[PDB]
Design a protein around this ligand. Structure first.
Ligand SMILES: Nc1nccc(-c2c[nH]c3c(Cl)c(Cl)ccc23)n1
Length: 330
């Protein structure tokens, strides 16, 4: 579809992203002096149409409450229909945090940049949480840099070139799954590696599932890889138990996912092949730390609080925003 024109002004010139829903494309705006925008074009299929309409309602709400994007939600500029596809026009951002990492060879982000990003992500999502919303699908692909311009220097530690962002400011995009407190809550939310245990065990969820997702994101920014390299539910839980300890008993008694359990324990053989895989790749959380200095212990203190098993006990983003890890921004 490169070369197509939407609503008589937007010429598609590139693909920015892609998904279940359809695609996001970079367009030239022939009616505003040729400067560039992003456009999400949704598939002409019911479930994606409905999500898109819902996204539009959330964006109108958010953009009216915070017209200047103080809280770092993406700004919708307009929306329209075109060959029965819903099209949402956004301010053009830069690469996703996922793509920047990949482009850098999976080198993790420096801790100073991680502090700034984490702050902005928690500030953004806390704004949602303050307005009776849960995002439900937070992940690095959905956090984008405002500008992804970088400098480059040789790093003798690693013996190769590396890219450092000029400006690490982010925005949160994709409100297609975002859910108000009083609306229907889908059975299964989130992308698997960022999915909270209440979701996996179908106990119901709310704002705390986003906090778990953020915890998972921050680990990835720090390591450059997931700690949950899995595509199977029961295995993902064995990995949790290896990194965080046993699942709380009350969660186990409440769940109807009885296939995952034997007596009141995870039905998991450590000596099986999958057992060896987990034992190889996963280890107690604090063992992933790359240094012992206090900045690192505090990041890890936050992470651990975000990866509390019981959503009732998990840290809230209002509490996260005052965590000591954030003081070097003051
Ligand atoms: N570059 C840019 N600038 C503004 C918005 C977007 C954008 C909004 N939603 C997106 C989704 Cl759901 C994906 Cl998967 C990829 C990009 C976007 N991207």
């Amino acid at each position: 579809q490169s070369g197509d024109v939407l609503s008589a002004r937007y010429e598609i010139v590139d693909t920015l992203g892609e998904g279940a829903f359809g695609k996001v494309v970079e367009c030239i705006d022939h009616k505003a002096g040729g400067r560039h925008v992003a456009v999400k074009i949704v598939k002409n299929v019911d479930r994606y149409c409905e999500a898109a309409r819902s996204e539009i309602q959330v964006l109108e709400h958010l953009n009216t409450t915070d017209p200047n994007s103080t809280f770092r939600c993406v700004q919708m500029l307009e929306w329209f229909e075109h060959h029965g596809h819903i099209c949402i026009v956004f301010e053009l951002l830069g690469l996703s945090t996922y793509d920047f990492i990949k482009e850098n060879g999976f080198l993790p982000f420096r801790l100073d940049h991680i502090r700034k990003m984490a702050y902005q992500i928690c500030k953004s999502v806390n704004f949602l949480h303050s307005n009776k919303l849960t995002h439900t699908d937070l992940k690095p692909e959905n956090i984008l840099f405002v500008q992804s311009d970088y400098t480059e220097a040789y790093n003798p530690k690693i013996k190769r070139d590396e890219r450092t962002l000029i400006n690490p400011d982010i925005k949160v995009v994709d409100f297609g799954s975002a859910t108000y407190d009083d609306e229907h809550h889908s059975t299964l939310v989130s992308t698997r590696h960022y999915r909270a245990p209440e979701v996996i065990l179908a106990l119901g969820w709310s704002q705390p599932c986003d906090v778990w997702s953020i915890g998972c994101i921050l680990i990835e920014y720090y390591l450059g890889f997931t700690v949950f390299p899995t595509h199977d539910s029961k295995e993902h839980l064995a990995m949790m138990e290896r990194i965080l300890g046993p699942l709380p008993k009350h969660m186990i008694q409440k769940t109807r996912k009885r296939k995952y359990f034997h007596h009141d324990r995870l039905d998991w053989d450590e000596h099986s092949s999958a057992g060896r895989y987990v034992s190889r790749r996963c280890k107690p959380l604090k063992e992933f730390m790359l240094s012992q200095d206090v900045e690192h212990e505090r990041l890890f203190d936050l992470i651990q609080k975000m990866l509390e098993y019981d959503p009732a006990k998990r840290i809230t983003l209002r509490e996260a925003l005052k965590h000591p890890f954030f003081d070097l921004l003051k």
